[PDB]
Amino acid sequence: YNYGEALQKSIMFYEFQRSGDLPADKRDNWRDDSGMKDGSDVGVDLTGGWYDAGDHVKFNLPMSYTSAMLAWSLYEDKDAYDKSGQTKYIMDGIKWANDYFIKCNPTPGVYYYQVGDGGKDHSWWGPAEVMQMERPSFKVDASKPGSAVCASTAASLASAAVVFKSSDPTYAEKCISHAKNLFDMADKAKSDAGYTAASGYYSSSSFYDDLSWAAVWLYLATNDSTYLDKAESYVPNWGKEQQTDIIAYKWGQCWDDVHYGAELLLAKLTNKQLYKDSIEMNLDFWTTGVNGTRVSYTPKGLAWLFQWGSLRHATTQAFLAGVYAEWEGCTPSKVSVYKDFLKSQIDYALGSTGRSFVVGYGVNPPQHPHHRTAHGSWTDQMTSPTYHRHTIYGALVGGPDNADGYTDEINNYVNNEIACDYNAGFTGALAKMYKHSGGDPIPNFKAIEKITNDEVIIKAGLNSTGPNYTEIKAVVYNQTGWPARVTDKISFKYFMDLSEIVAAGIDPLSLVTSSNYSEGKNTKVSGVLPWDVSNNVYYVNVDLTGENIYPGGQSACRREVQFRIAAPQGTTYWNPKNDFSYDGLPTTSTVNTVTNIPVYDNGVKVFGNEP
Template identity: 35%
Template sequence: MGDTGSLRLVPHCPRLLIALVLLGLSFTVSVAGAFNYADALTKSLLYFEAQRSGRLPHNQRVTWRDHSGLTDGLEQGVDLVGGYYDAGDHVKFGLPMAFTVTMLSWSVIEYSGQIDSTGEMEHALEAIKWGTDYFMKAHTSPTVLWAEVGDGDTDHYCWQRPEDMTTSRRAYKVDENNPGSDLAGETAAAMAAASIVFRRRNPHYSSLLLHHAQQLFEFGDKYRGEYDRSVEEVKSYYGSVSGYKDELLWAALWLHRATDGEYYLSYAINKAHCFGGVGWAMTEFSWDVKYAGIQVMASQLLMNEKHGVHGHVLQMYRSKAEHYICSCLNLNNGSNVDRTPGGLLYVRQWNNMQYVSSAAFLLMVYSDQVLAGSDEEIRCPGGSVGRAEVTAFVKSQADYILGSNPMNMSYLVGFGPSYPRRVHHRGASIVSYREYRGFIGCTQGYDNWYARQEPNPNVVVGALVGGPDCQDNFFDQRGNYMQTEACTYNTAPLVGVFARLMQLEGQSGELEDGIENFPLRASYRK
């Protein structure tokens, strides 16, 4: 489960030497040459197949999974089969799922050529479409969007495979009387971004996505309110701390990018102040808090001369985008993102890696799209930096994830020789349903599988776990969910990051471990 976000600025920590920070030189950088980013990209996309809910397709590569959640929505008279489980549990939460799809789509939009060169484009499209197919089912009328399937509290009483679920599959919705502008806005953003991805590849599907996105934006804007007030069951898991104004701005910018419509751009310009777009100076970007992403997207619009009439407001957006970047580079005065001794961005204790991967993506996009082709520098209070320094910092964070860290461990499961073996994940920690079809109940799962000291019988390849603590320590224990649980929105931004780093390093799409040879299922011992 994800933690609730926060708008507070992360406390300042003592600055590392700027040169070391920008070059990403933590004290354990001892890996010869670059990591195989193509391999990391391939494995990242594989992870989404492990998180699928519903009836699995014939080309399913994660063979330890099987069909699940086949009656989702039945109790409410609606078909809600499909979509993604967010993490190591079996609730389908709409807000983080939509953000996952938005980030996957943004990765493909910005780095399609690089992804295509690895032969992974089809898998990327499948990962996006598995989410958007579900969103279209969940959007049953212009002003109804199903927000959640399952219940977090009852789900946590059980330790079961998804194929054996006995917990509640009740579905919850937002509508005119029970608004959810943040959920509607993020889902609109996801579908608008995906419509760009499929525009040439599947024009009819793209048009359908855009239609849903426009309806959802109108619904979210007309009937305003936080979704966690309408669906109180979500509060403990994915409460909307930032409110809904960031999601409405986010959706407007994505709809503008999808349609080139002036209405959506004017919305983001006219509400820039009152919705906080040019007011919030951020030090995080997440499934809950979208402001830094909004500010980077708005900065990209400055590259187009036809938006000159909005130049003043767009420059204010850019100023806040650069505050975020400076905070990541440890070059602000008093409002930097904290660091571990090994150089990893550190926002908070629970599932910190989500903030690392999303920051790496935003900085890479800003470097490529706003700073590209110019001698411009970002003028931070602690010094000016250019494109090369920003890119070097992104690489340092990606390399930390892949093994250049004090633990000498890859936090991307399945990558390299050392990675977490006891991921907090119900399906991975219990013998595969395809190997043992006998029923495993709630308490049986806890008694026989949860407390086992052995590695998980199934490997969740491509999962980015929560990661180390503020001192670079990591404890590979199944019950240590703050560090060993992985989420879909952790991995999604890495697709674009790995694709771009692969190109920068001049790597081919060859893999270290072919997927067909990878041990997707470890040996099972009773």
């Protein structure tokens, strides 16, 4: 498999998750500014960071877990990133998350750990750029603690400091300053009691693991052994295997449990047997098995841990196995076992079963990941359109069940959602496979997509008619996607040939235009205006400027306008047949897309034709 391309796309995945004011240097044409008022409720700029999964909540625990894991990869395999030419991209990602965590620590002792409400956010299915719901900010402090999330963020900031120190020593120091404050908060409190806004999504079941993980990274960033001593001091407090006094080993590294990564690092830093034994017990359980126990394996080779995000778990363990196998302290006989495991799990994700589980990569990749912005519905419907308008490159889907079963459907969020933490360890494992087996990334890769549907259209039909008038029912639709956006400067024009009016000795400008119905309070229908009088062409201008038309609902994306143009009552010379906009017009109140009632966006024609 082409591991370099996979690595390249896995890193790119995060760029599509970005919230906030996006860079001018962005390499896609379908994501734009969003969550621009994040933090406005507390008077703090909390814009930026990454949306968690297929949704738009910013959950700092998995977000910081993710950036800490990406930095860990860059720390372990900078040469792989340099050789593949992806170094700039992963560093930009790491900085994107950490710049946001810094904003979340506005003053010593205060940490905002979330922006958005799961309940409200998930109740709407649409693109990030046009979210209309409230996005509350939540914080922890001395009176309401969040040890896991504060320490997880400290680990992200400290690991970022380690990998940025050589090229940007000042940013490294900035990261360390904030990591120290957040760790102090976490260490002083030793409680997750104030971390409640993520209930039902990312509630924490442990924080001593996060304390050790953060302390290890702060040790590597500052070289102050005060932190190494702390890291080791929490070990007795880590969860144990049931009815044993053995450090847990039957799960895997993940957003809720980072003792696996902490013990791996502590083994390399101290060479103490306790840590070596602990990480090898975990890696053994995942490979050969240990003490009669072994993680389940699917018939096709996937180490299967749990129903949700099976690939996320397997590929993360693959990364840890790769890191540990390269360490001189690893039991020699297990080096090959662990490396074989890294390859088998990554290959399963990339295509060993005959298809890829990575969006926009390989053979028969997933087409319907549970992701709002990549899908791009403009009607608040998971079912419409019936295909994803965008390709969210690099995203690793949840994964199959214990029997390799997998259904690529948008509503399957258990096995087909995509998320920050899903790609975290995966990215690191990919860097290792690239280093070993290669595969050239795509040069100058970008995600500038072809526009696949007219972004703003109009449908019309004959509402009412008479010997002296024509009444039109028109509906404008915002189907924007590159990027999805509010269209508050839309207008359209209805063209007529009024030669018969001039011939009747009547002023075309005196005809009466009117509207008996229209959605939108700003809808304005003009009187008859001249367009090309040499050919007796006049028009009615319908301005929708000011209307908050956006691709996020059946009513939200459309504006209906009914308007009539009429010659004097009792007259019979009105002739709609020579009117440009009347040609082909649906003969009734049931509208259809028309191309002769042009739509304009800030005066620029974007749909339809003029006379």
